[PDB]
Structure formats: C-alpha cells, structure tokens
C-alpha cells in the first residue's frame, strides 16, 4: 500500500511525500522474510536516494549509505549510480551525469521510475546552468556556452530554440552569427490592452442602438 503511493506521489513530483512513503516500505521489506522482498528492499532504497537528488540535498544520499544495508545487504550497480548523479547535479555539471548514465546504462534500462526522473533531472539541470551563463552576457557565442554547459555546439542551439518557446527568457537565437540575445523587455502596455476592450464594448453597444432606430425607418 505504501509502495504504490510512494511511486505515484514521486511521479506527481513531490519528493517530500515520496521519501516518507519509501522510508516506511524500507522498514517492512528489509526486516521481514524474503521471497521477492530482497528485490523490493533493493528497489525502494534506490528511489530513496533519487528523491534527495531532486531536492538538491546530496548529504542525505551519503547519510543513507553505509555498508550495513546499502553497500552490504543490498549492493547493486544502482547504488553507485545514484551517488554519481548526486555529485553531478550538485556540481552543476551535466557532463558528469552524461558519463554517469553511460556506464550505469543497465540500471537505467531496467527501471521505469529512474528513467522518467533522469529525464526530469536532465532538463531541470540544463536550464539552471544555462541561466548562469546568459544572465551577465548578451551577444554571446553558442560555442562559448557549450564548453561550460558540457554539450555539443548543436545540442545547445537545439535546446535554446525550446527555452524561447516556453518563454523562460523569451529571446531569439541568431544562427547566422551564432549569438544569443536575451530580451526581458516588456512588449506590452496596460493602456493599449484595456483600450481593445473599451472599443470592443462600443461595437456591441452600437448593434443594440441599431434595433431601437429600426422604428424610425
């Protein structure tokens, strides 16, 4: 019961509830008899490490670890993965994660929940680093972003196109010089918007007037 809820609130993206539920199921699975609860202690444990990585508190990934149940009783490739990704999100190094999931690929393929949260994780990580670079910069080359961010030149240009569409900086990428302009400018004014409504009102009113004048004709 707790397991199911654990996965589902984790997916809904609340990692405070997930961690509590997956702590509860850790107590049950670990200490009662094993028939498949070997496999299910091991899996709940990996999702406990994952939840902390999303919060960006990575000391708690390390507090959970110890060779008493985490590198002793359940010892998997998956344990090494989680601390690798943990270091990488904290560092702000998307390159470290990219190396990490390459060599922990077999953990990744086998679990659905990890795979969903390592996508969530990739895009949240990419946006936070990307910001840092383009906040004190304008007219900045795409090659220059790429070195810092850990990505190919193209991969950067492709991603940048999507950030504009979400409107998280709403700029334009100029591809013929490779420069990125960030525009935070208001292109909107209050008077003008309210004026479109005011005029709108009068058009409806003039139809209503026309009926009353029908008698004259």
């Amino acid at each position: 019961l707790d397991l199911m809820s654990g996965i589902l609130h984790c997916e809904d993206k609340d990692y405070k509830t997930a961690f509590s539920y997956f702590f509860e199921s850790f107590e049950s699975y670990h200490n009662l008899t094993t028939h498949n609860s070997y496999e299910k202690a091991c899996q709940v444990l990996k999702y406990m490490l994952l939840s902390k990585i999303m919060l960006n508190l990575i000391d708690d990934v390390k507090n959970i670890l110890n060779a008493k149940y985490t590198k002793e009783t359940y010892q998997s490739r998956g344990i090494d993965a989680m601390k690798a990704v943990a270091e990488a999100y904290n560092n702000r190094s998307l390159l470290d994660f990219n190396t990490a999931l390459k060599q922990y690929e077999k953990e990744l393929m086998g679990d659905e929940l990890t795979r969903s949260h390592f996508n969530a994780l990739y895009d949240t990580l990419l946006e936070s680093n990307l910001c840092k670079i383009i906040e004190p910069f304008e007219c900045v080359e795409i090659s220059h972003i790429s070195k810092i961010i850990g990505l190919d030149t193209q991969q950067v240009e492709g991603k940048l196109s999507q950030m504009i569409l979400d409107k998280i900086f709403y700029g334009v990428l100029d591809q013929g010089n490779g420069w990125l302009y960030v525009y935070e400018t208001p292109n909107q004014d209050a008077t003008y918007d309210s004026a479109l409504e005011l005029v709108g009102q009068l058009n409806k009113v003039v139809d209503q007037l026309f009926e009353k004048a029908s008698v004259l004709y």
Binding site: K132, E135, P136, F137, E138, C139, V140, E141, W179
Partner: protein, 146 residues
Amino acid sequence: SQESLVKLFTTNELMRWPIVQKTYEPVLNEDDLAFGGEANKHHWEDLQKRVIEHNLRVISEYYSRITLLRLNELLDLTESQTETYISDLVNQGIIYAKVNRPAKIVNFEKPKNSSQLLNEWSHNVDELLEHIETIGHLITKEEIMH
C-alpha cells in the same frame, strides 16, 4: 602605516595592482599576520582580487560604456580573467552589466524605463522656475543698494 592602506579603499578612485603590490612590500608584507606570513603568504595573492572588485564598482558608475580591450588594461588582467570577474559580480548584486563575448564592448548600466527618465525631466523644470523667482528679488534689492 595602517592609514595609507585603508585610505585607498575608502576612496572611489581608480587603482592598479602592480603599484599597490610594491608600495606595501617592505612595510606590511614584512609584518606577519597581514601578508607574507605562510597562510598569509597565500593571502598576498588574494589582495589582487580586492583591487579588481573595487575598481569595477568605480568603473560601472563612471563609464556608462567602455571597450573591453581597454578594460583588461585597467584591472591588469587578460580577457579570460576579466569576463569571469564581471559575471560573478553581476550575480552578487553590486553592479548590473552586460558583457559581449566576440570582443566588442562591455556596457555597465542600471535599467531605466520611460516613465523614470521623464520624472527626472519634470523635477529639472520645476527647480529652474524656483531659480528665476529668487533672481528677480535680488534685482529689486539692488535698487535699494545703489
């Protein structure tokens, strides 16, 4: 002895590292628990950062626009160093800036809307009319004098 070092950073003048280094080299680099001790030998190296970060305050206020190529002379840095130190310093909130990567111009500025610029322009006008009224009173007054 103390007064000459502290005085430099209470003013908002320009200053340059190879010069500041030399001045205090047989005064305070020869006093331990300041610069030139052991752990303090590795803080003489820190003094460099302080001079730069103070200079950027001055330069932002004073230059509304300056070339980068000029900026790297001033701070006594090369291009790689100079961009890093402006970027960190924009985040901290002391200055607000935009830096261009091809090697064009680095503009230091604070945002100013249409409404804001005009407000200043309202105040100028009001103040000019107060100036003229008091001037008419002292002319009348001169007729009494002579």
